[PDB]
Amino acid sequence: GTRITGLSSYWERYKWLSAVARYVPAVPNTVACQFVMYIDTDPLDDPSNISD
């Protein structure tokens, strides 16, 4: 859907030089929950099989 995925299949390789993901909320200051956001660099480390 993005143009970058459209344009990505017209070259062989890539490398993210700068990549900062910017969370935008859509919620007021009246509900509260704590997130933690990160970019793991290994695409095969999966936290989905942790029992704790």
């Binding site: 143009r3 344009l7 910017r22 935008v24």
Partner: peptide, 23 residues
């Protein structure tokens, strides 16, 4: 050889911040 062309087929998206008071 290798050459590094600055590709100019993108467009920006600048982010602005605000926020409403209670009154």
């Amino acid at each position: 050889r290798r050459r590094v062309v600055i590709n100019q087929s993108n467009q920006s998206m600048p982010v602005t911040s605000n926020g409403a008071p209670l009154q």
